[PDB]
Amino acid sequence: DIAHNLAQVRDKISAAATRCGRSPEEITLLAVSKTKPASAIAEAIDAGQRQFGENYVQEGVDKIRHFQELGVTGLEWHFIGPLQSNKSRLVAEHFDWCHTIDRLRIATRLNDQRPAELPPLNVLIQINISDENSASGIQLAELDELAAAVAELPRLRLRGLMAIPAPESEYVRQFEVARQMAVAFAGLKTRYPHIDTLSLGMSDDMEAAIAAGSTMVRIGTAIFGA
């Protein structure tokens, strides 16, 4: 039951924040609805969920159009999959956030294809913090340069960082890796304006990510099922 699962997940986030001294409000729950039907998103909506994350462009665009044509206001849609250049226009025209800026050229494409009447597209720069086997995300050594270039693009708004750490079973390492992201995120925050989003943490490392300083966790299966 989606309404019940949403309650259980929000309770875990709330408990995790309180234990480490943070206010639960600091943690945004991103409900990841990739591969799940619109009817399931509609249940999450009827239960108060507003921010949804999708990974595949046409799947996400169809969902966005569906809920626009029902007139459901609110809703923030986050593109959290890898973005290839020949599908960037659909993202720039329909999505509210994109977490996967990992090269300047995809950012400038998004900037250029974003209609001027929409709000700036909120973007995070994706760090490959700990994953040998991923071609996604930049190294931390590249952050300052990419952030400067991206932050000039006027139809985008650089809001912080995202990372998908390598899968890790040890809590100690979950926290250390996440802390590395939190540190980079703080250092970014001193120099840049409106840095407020660390997209970090899924079901299995949720506690360490929150304790480390994440502002947003991405939960799919624990909400929608398998």
Ligand SMILES: *Cc1c(COP(=O)(O)O)cnc(C)c1O
């Ligand atoms: C699929 C996905 C999630 C959610 O996955 P679950 O383990 O099913 O909760 C979170 N973040 C990203 C980037 C994803 O692709």
